[PDB]
Design an enzyme around this catalytic site. Sequence first.
Site, PDB file in Angstrom:
ATOM      1  CG  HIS A  13      -0.411   0.472   2.406  1.00 58.18           C
ATOM      2  ND1 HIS A  13      -0.146  -0.366   3.469  1.00 58.18           N
ATOM      3  CD2 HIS A  13      -0.144   1.725   2.848  1.00 58.18           C
ATOM      4  CE1 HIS A  13       0.281   0.334   4.513  1.00 58.18           C
ATOM      5  NE2 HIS A  13       0.253   1.615   4.168  1.00 58.18           N
ATOM      6  CG  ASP A  49      -0.250  -3.806   2.681  1.00 55.87           C
ATOM      7  OD1 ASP A  49       0.383  -3.415   1.691  1.00 55.87           O
ATOM      8  OD2 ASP A  49      -0.517  -3.125   3.715  1.00 55.87           O
ATOM      9  CB  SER A 108       2.725   1.868   6.271  1.00 52.89           C
ATOM     10  OG  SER A 108       1.541   1.899   6.967  1.00 52.89           O
ATOM     11  N   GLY A 109       5.041  -0.445   6.166  1.00 47.71           N
ATOM     12  CA  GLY A 109       6.087  -0.962   5.305  1.00 47.71           C
ATOM     13  C   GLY A 109       7.295  -1.426   6.141  1.00 47.71           C
ATOM     14  N   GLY A 157       2.886   6.282   8.598  1.00 50.94           N
ATOM     15  CA  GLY A 157       4.307   6.569   8.284  1.00 50.94           C
ATOM     16  C   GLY A 157       5.268   5.425   8.782  1.00 50.94           C
TER      17      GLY A 157
HETATM   18  N1  LIG Z   1     -16.583   8.689  -7.618  1.00 52.21           N
HETATM   19  C1  LIG Z   1     -17.155   7.695  -6.795  1.00 52.21           C
HETATM   20  C2  LIG Z   1     -16.968   8.002  -5.338  1.00 52.21           C
HETATM   21  C3  LIG Z   1     -18.083   8.216  -4.612  1.00 52.21           C
HETATM   22  C4  LIG Z   1     -17.972   8.489  -3.307  1.00 52.21           C
HETATM   23  C5  LIG Z   1     -16.766   8.567  -2.694  1.00 52.21           C
HETATM   24  C6  LIG Z   1     -15.615   8.372  -3.380  1.00 52.21           C
HETATM   25  C7  LIG Z   1     -14.340   8.434  -2.635  1.00 52.21           C
HETATM   26  C8  LIG Z   1     -13.949   7.043  -2.149  1.00 52.21           C
HETATM   27  C9  LIG Z   1     -12.607   7.028  -1.420  1.00 52.21           C
HETATM   28  N2  LIG Z   1     -11.654   7.567  -2.364  1.00 52.21           N
HETATM   29  C10 LIG Z   1     -10.641   6.871  -2.898  1.00 52.21           C
HETATM   30  O1  LIG Z   1      -9.936   7.375  -3.710  1.00 52.21           O
HETATM   31  C11 LIG Z   1     -10.324   5.442  -2.559  1.00 52.21           C
HETATM   32  C12 LIG Z   1     -10.206   4.537  -3.587  1.00 52.21           C
HETATM   33  C13 LIG Z   1      -9.900   3.223  -3.409  1.00 52.21           C
HETATM   34  C14 LIG Z   1      -9.688   2.758  -2.157  1.00 52.21           C
HETATM   35  C15 LIG Z   1      -9.801   3.650  -1.116  1.00 52.21           C
HETATM   36  N3  LIG Z   1      -9.632   3.166   0.097  1.00 52.21           N
HETATM   37  C16 LIG Z   1      -8.484   3.041   0.696  1.00 52.21           C
HETATM   38  O2  LIG Z   1      -7.461   2.473   0.309  1.00 52.21           O
HETATM   39  C17 LIG Z   1      -8.698   3.587   2.035  1.00 52.21           C
HETATM   40  C18 LIG Z   1      -7.511   3.731   2.942  1.00 52.21           C
HETATM   41  O3  LIG Z   1      -7.533   2.677   3.904  1.00 52.21           O
HETATM   42  C19 LIG Z   1      -6.184   3.935   2.223  1.00 52.21           C
HETATM   43  C20 LIG Z   1      -5.892   5.109   3.161  1.00 52.21           C
HETATM   44  C21 LIG Z   1      -7.312   5.021   3.721  1.00 52.21           C
HETATM   45  O4  LIG Z   1      -9.684   4.602   2.003  1.00 52.21           O
HETATM   46  C22 LIG Z   1     -10.976   4.087   2.320  1.00 52.21           C
HETATM   47  C23 LIG Z   1     -11.998   3.951   1.200  1.00 52.21           C
HETATM   48  C24 LIG Z   1     -12.911   4.913   1.940  1.00 52.21           C
HETATM   49  C25 LIG Z   1     -11.915   5.014   3.071  1.00 52.21           C
HETATM   50  C26 LIG Z   1     -10.630   2.832   3.073  1.00 52.21           C
HETATM   51  O5  LIG Z   1     -11.552   1.749   2.875  1.00 52.21           O
HETATM   52  C27 LIG Z   1     -10.138   3.145   4.457  1.00 52.21           C
HETATM   53  O6  LIG Z   1     -10.103   4.256   4.914  1.00 52.21           O
HETATM   54  N4  LIG Z   1      -9.612   2.111   5.051  1.00 52.21           N
HETATM   55  C28 LIG Z   1      -9.374   1.936   6.346  1.00 52.21           C
HETATM   56  C29 LIG Z   1      -9.912   0.796   6.878  1.00 52.21           C
HETATM   57  C30 LIG Z   1      -9.673   0.495   8.183  1.00 52.21           C
HETATM   58  C31 LIG Z   1      -8.880   1.340   8.950  1.00 52.21           C
HETATM   59  C32 LIG Z   1      -8.339   2.492   8.446  1.00 52.21           C
HETATM   60  C33 LIG Z   1      -7.514   3.345   9.371  1.00 52.21           C
HETATM   61  O7  LIG Z   1      -7.986   3.650  10.408  1.00 52.21           O
HETATM   62  N5  LIG Z   1      -6.284   3.734   9.060  1.00 52.21           N
HETATM   63  C34 LIG Z   1      -5.591   4.743   9.793  1.00 52.21           C
HETATM   64  C35 LIG Z   1      -4.463   4.027  10.536  1.00 52.21           C
HETATM   65  C36 LIG Z   1      -3.510   3.396   9.547  1.00 52.21           C
HETATM   66  C37 LIG Z   1      -2.367   2.659  10.134  1.00 52.21           C
HETATM   67  C38 LIG Z   1      -1.146   2.677   9.507  1.00 52.21           C
HETATM   68  C39 LIG Z   1      -0.088   1.976   9.999  1.00 52.21           C
HETATM   69  C40 LIG Z   1      -0.276   1.235  11.131  1.00 52.21           C
HETATM   70  C41 LIG Z   1      -1.473   1.213  11.779  1.00 52.21           C
HETATM   71  C42 LIG Z   1      -1.606   0.344  13.011  1.00 52.21           C
HETATM   72  N6  LIG Z   1      -1.731   1.112  14.204  1.00 52.21           N
HETATM   73  C43 LIG Z   1      -2.519   1.920  11.249  1.00 52.21           C
HETATM   74  C44 LIG Z   1      -4.297   2.503   8.608  1.00 52.21           C
HETATM   75  C45 LIG Z   1      -5.505   3.184   7.968  1.00 52.21           C
HETATM   76  C46 LIG Z   1      -8.574   2.786   7.113  1.00 52.21           C
HETATM   77  O8  LIG Z   1      -9.414   2.486   2.515  1.00 52.21           O
HETATM   78  C47 LIG Z   1     -10.102   4.984  -1.290  1.00 52.21           C
HETATM   79  C48 LIG Z   1     -11.897   8.944  -2.710  1.00 52.21           C
HETATM   80  C49 LIG Z   1     -13.238   9.077  -3.421  1.00 52.21           C
HETATM   81  C50 LIG Z   1     -15.751   8.112  -4.720  1.00 52.21           C
END
Ligand SMILES: NCc1cccc(C2CCN(C(=O)c3cccc(NC(=O)[C@@]4(C5(O)CCC5)OC5(CCC5)[C@](O)(C(=O)Nc5cccc(C(=O)N6CCC(c7cccc(CN)c7)CC6)c5)O4)c3)CC2)c1
Lengths: 243, 243, 243, 243
Positions: free
Chosen positions: A44, A91, A194-195, A192
């Site tokens: 990722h 991932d 990650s990886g 930050g």
């Molecule tokens: N035109 C149609 C349309 C209509 C309505 C809305 C949209 C949006 C959709 C979202 N979007 C994208 O481009 C998009 C595209 C593909 C995939 C994603 N999703 C993701 O990859 C992401 C992320 O996880 C990547 C960074 C956030 O974004 C989503 C989709 C909506 C939110 C998500 O499913 C998501 O946020 N995932 C997610 C799921 C579970 C937990 C966390 C979270 O809390 N994080 C923060 C902490 C972090 C972390 C990093 C390192 C270590 C730790 C451990 N402590 C944690 C990990 C992510 C994040 O995945 C987003 C913008 C436009 C579009």
Amino acid sequence: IVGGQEAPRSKWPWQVSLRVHGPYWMHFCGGSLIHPQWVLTAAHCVGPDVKDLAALRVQLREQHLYYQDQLLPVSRIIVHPQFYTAQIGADIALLELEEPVKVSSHVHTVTLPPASETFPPGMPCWVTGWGDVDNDERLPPPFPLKQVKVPIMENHICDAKYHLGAYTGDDVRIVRDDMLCAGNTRRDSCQGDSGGPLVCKVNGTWLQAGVVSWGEGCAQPNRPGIYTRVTYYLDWIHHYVPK
Amino acid sequence: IVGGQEAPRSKWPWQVSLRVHGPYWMHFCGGSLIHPQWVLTAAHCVGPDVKDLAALRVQLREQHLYYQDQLLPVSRIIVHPQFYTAQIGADIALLELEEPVKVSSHVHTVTLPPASETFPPGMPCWVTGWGDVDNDERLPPPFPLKQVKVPIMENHICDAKYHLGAYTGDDVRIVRDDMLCAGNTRRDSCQGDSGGPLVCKVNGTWLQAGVVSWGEGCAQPNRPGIYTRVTYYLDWIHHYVPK
Amino acid sequence: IVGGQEAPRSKWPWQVSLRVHGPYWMHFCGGSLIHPQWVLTAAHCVGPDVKDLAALRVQLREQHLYYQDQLLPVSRIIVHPQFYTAQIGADIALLELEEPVKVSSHVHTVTLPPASETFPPGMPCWVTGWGDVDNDERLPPPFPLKQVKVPIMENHICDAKYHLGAYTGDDVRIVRDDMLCAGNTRRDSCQGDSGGPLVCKVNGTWLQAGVVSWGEGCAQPNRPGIYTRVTYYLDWIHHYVPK
Amino acid sequence: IVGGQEAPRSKWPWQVSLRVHGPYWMHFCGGSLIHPQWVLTAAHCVGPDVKDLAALRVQLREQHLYYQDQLLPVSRIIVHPQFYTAQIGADIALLELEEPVKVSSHVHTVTLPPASETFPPGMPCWVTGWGDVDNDERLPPPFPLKQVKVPIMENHICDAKYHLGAYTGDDVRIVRDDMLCAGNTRRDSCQGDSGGPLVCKVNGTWLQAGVVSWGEGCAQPNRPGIYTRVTYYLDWIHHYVPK
Ligand SMILES: NCc1cccc(C2CCN(C(=O)c3cccc(NC(=O)[C@@]4(C5(O)CCC5)OC5(CCC5)[C@](O)(C(=O)Nc5cccc(C(=O)N6CCC(c7cccc(CN)c7)CC6)c5)O4)c3)CC2)c1
Ligand SMILES: NCc1cccc(C2CCN(C(=O)c3cccc(NC(=O)[C@@]4(C5(O)CCC5)OC5(CCC5)[C@](O)(C(=O)Nc5cccc(C(=O)N6CCC(c7cccc(CN)c7)CC6)c5)O4)c3)CC2)c1
């Protein structure tokens, strides 16, 4: 890194920082040196969309980001083809360096676990990196490499915890079999980091158990950090990385 | 909504706005009235973590957000149990209102499709909402409800576009069989449209084909918007919502 | 600094960095060491409201901010009593350190001008600091001390430029007689340079002509940087700072 | 407006909102209708640098910004030529409308005070506008016009208060003779109210005493709101505005 402290200069000789081209070569993810010419990181960090290799560089272990950079170019990004998002899994990614690194006491590789390695629950392992120190709280200048000791947990318990306080059906899996969990509300990896590596000293030898992958925020109740399980992907790693 | 126009007052009597408590009851997602006591929306608007019901209200169709609010409290949030993230799927949820609303020509229910309808390319379909008008570009005051006509793209064609410019292997499915794709680089839903309706006119009656779910950005090359396919989840909806 | 280069280690031994307590001791203004126990800076960096002394420290010359900090506490903040805002003038202040510093070739005092020196156009003058490298554009890590050579513009010429594109009447003086102007659309001080030195080489000895004070933006047409004119305030400085 | 509440629809018929061209015609300052063809505002809203008249419009009294705009073009900006910053003073400007407004019970002019008018200390006066509700806290949608009752204070006391907790010499004036102060730590004007009116009902008749100009933040201890004193500038007003 949440709940950690700054690492000793002699520890974590395999930590690397991944840099993206802009106004400066900014840190965006960690990685580990697993061979003189290869870095293991999270998919990722560099995917799933293809990115310009000219805009990526690697930095070998630094005690403070940016101070004494000697940035290294990358010759190939290999993203696991099963990857689309961290929550689905796969991932994991490799970066092939333009040159093999000359290893030293200070900068050198980490050992990958045998396929049969079982990191038991509760085993003290360490996660490192230059990520956020809490949710939406950047690591301050001068950007010291941080470390934190995080106990391994069983997938079944990690999965269960992610269901507490969620609508997701208790039989619908969240924490997949290619993932591994560690941490708690005081100690965790964060954005930050990650990886980068999760390492466990097994009978005297450091092995890389995990690659920082995801979680719901950082150090939140019942939301331990989730890592890519290295043993799961050894065969894919060794398809590219000499043994 | 990207490439819309403002909707006429007489259109889309089922559109609703979901509000979260803070300095003001701020719009964060759309929905649709599918029965006098039930709103259909996206799971990701309200899940997968359990929210305080008291911090959520529903606003029935309004031509401009906030100016004439009459906020309604919610008695139950019901999120599909398979739901964890929009990319995995089951991005569908139901809100039961504390009271049945009164219907009129102004404000009334949308008709759910029969299980057999596939919504193939060339169907006249519209998506509506109060979301961003382009990537990272808010709908300005006075926040009119917008609409845009979006062309449907067959799933396999959509899936194949999603693989262009990606590392993800071509046989690892991105656009799942419980999703539906519509939109192009001129016409799309965007953030804050999520949970709202994609409706198509079939033999003179508007049927809700989709729930705004996700995409890579908004109106980006090779990245049509993705919607939860309502036919997939009729049995689930019918567990809760009367005829 | 706009249009600089990074300073050589051997230059500007009087430059200091003023730090405010928060998640880290963050640079917010420069200064200059004018005696072993006294720093000269801009009033607007520390006034006109009275600050907690405990939340302020001084860092002596450093080539990169933060990496090798040895922060020094301040015993007194002394702000010119005529000071209210930089546009009105008297933008000058003194910090007394809790201890006298030790000097060396590395770190030493700057010489104040005699009262008679006017610093006319064509004098070789340099401004130094850790401020922005253009409008709303931060100095990136690793935060090197920058320098730039800036041409002096006579006050009346400067004042007249400040009136171009303004409603302010031409006989209502903007650039005051206790200020000095230097810089152009390629070479200027910027935010976070405030309080630092403008130094000019006069008969082989660097003299501090100015204190970085204000301007309309940085390196903007007809808007040279404005500095507090040190000669104006010698008597005041000498009330506090020994020979 | 800090500490206020939403105005009755029948009050403040002279309030105007000043709009700047961008993604939408955004409110940036208030003003008052002082003649059918003239708006009184603050110089700092529109100066000291010259701005494009095509990018400015006026909106007459609205209960909620943006909902029912009928924007009016401006034919001339007249900024007091003594103006450079609010703290120096002369913070007053007129806007000549392209057409005279047809006045009504709902939209009509405010009365300017005679030159001899003495607004005594403690007189209850009212300030109105659509500005921030506290420091760095925007007025929420739907942007109701707010009002707050603020007592007039003597300049000598206002000046004294601004010296409490400041380095500025007690004999160095801060609150100039062309300014007027009102408010306290519970009631004040704030950012985005600038340019709007401070009105006092004197023996049954509303008179405009002040134009919102500046202050150190909003509703801070010993920092009452500072206004341009209308009586001071009557002669300049009446040089352009028919009597
Ligand atoms: N035109 C149609 C349309 C209509 C309505 C809305 C949209 C949006 C959709 C979202 N979007 C994208 O481009 C998009 C595209 C593909 C995939 C994603 N999703 C993701 O990859 C992401 C992320 O996880 C990547 C960074 C956030 O974004 C989503 C989709 C909506 C939110 C998500 O499913 C998501 O946020 N995932 C997610 C799921 C579970 C937990 C966390 C979270 O809390 N994080 C923060 C902490 C972090 C972390 C990093 C390192 C270590 C730790 C451990 N402590 C944690 C990990 C992510 C994040 O995945 C987003 C913008 C436009 C579009
Ligand atoms: N290249 C040389 C160089 C070197 C170093 C630094 C720079 C900077 C200088 C600043 N700058 C300018 O462009 C600039 C230019 C001319 C004038 C100003 N100053 C201002 O007009 C302003 C403002 O007051 C206008 C908005 C802020 O900015 C200054 C200069 C540095 C800060 C200042 O002197 C200032 O901030 N004045 C000030 C003085 C006293 C109080 C408050 C304040 O607290 N406010 C917030 C509350 C608000 C308010 C509005 C309505 C009602 C109330 C009553 N409750 C309060 C009034 C302003 C603000 O004036 C700024 C950017 C570049 C340049």
